[PDB]
Amino acid sequence: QIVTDNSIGNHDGYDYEFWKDSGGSGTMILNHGGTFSAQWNNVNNILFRKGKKFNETQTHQQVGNMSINYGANFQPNGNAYLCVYGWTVDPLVEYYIVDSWGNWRPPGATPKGTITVDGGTYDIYETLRVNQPSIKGIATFKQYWSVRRSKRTSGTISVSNHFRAWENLGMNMGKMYEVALTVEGYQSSGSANVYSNTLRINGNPLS
Ligand SMILES: *[C@H]1OC[C@@H](O[C@@H]2OC[C@@H](O)[C@H](O)[C@H]2O)[C@H](O)[C@H]1F
DSSP states (O other): OEEOSSEEEEETTEEEEEEEOSSSEEEEEEOSTTOEEEEEESOSEEEEEEEEEOOSOOOHHHHOOEEEEEEEEEEEESSEEEEEEEEEETTTEEEEEEEEESSSOSOOSOOOEEEEETTEEEEEEEEEEEEEOOTTSSEEEEEEEEEESSOOSEEEEOHHHHHHHHHHTTOOOOEEEEEEEEEEEESOEEEEEEEEEEEEETTEEOO
16 A cells, blocks of 8 residues: 555556656555645655546536545645546646645746636636656646635645636636546655545545
């Protein structure tokens, strides 16, 4: 259940993934259901997550309503994000719904709009990754973001509301590849205890 290097699998019904580039270290402990704990030290980039991976055949509307109820003890020492994260394919898009961060509020771009949902206000952004790692190899792809205006580390994220806002703004989405509660670190160290993480699709928890 101890993951300290790149790994993808399923643990207690949740698709887990540990992903890092070279340098530093990370430790992910897979706990019950969608839960896990994470610790990182002097990394370049590291991501820890537990959610659902899909077979790339359905739009988010076809999957249905996606909602995540979570709670995490988030203790970054520097740059890190606590978020819902995933990808679409055709087009290849990496996305983030950021509820908390460390010393820097991402993603450093001019907002494209705002969404009010789940008792918060999020700024919406679109950024570009050029020849970077991806679920489909070294690629150039967009990153879509919703970033909360104030931090929080527990609550419910109505994922599908964010997708509709993005599509409303012309941020095109492809077929679902993944949706997951994620901890990301960048050129930093820290820890996070994800003690609560339930993904519901059409009101039904993952299993
Ligand atoms: C957003 O997250 C980190 C990185 O995405 C990883 O790409 C490699 C793939 O194997 C992992 O599953 C992804 O998390 C991407 O470059 C960045 F934009």
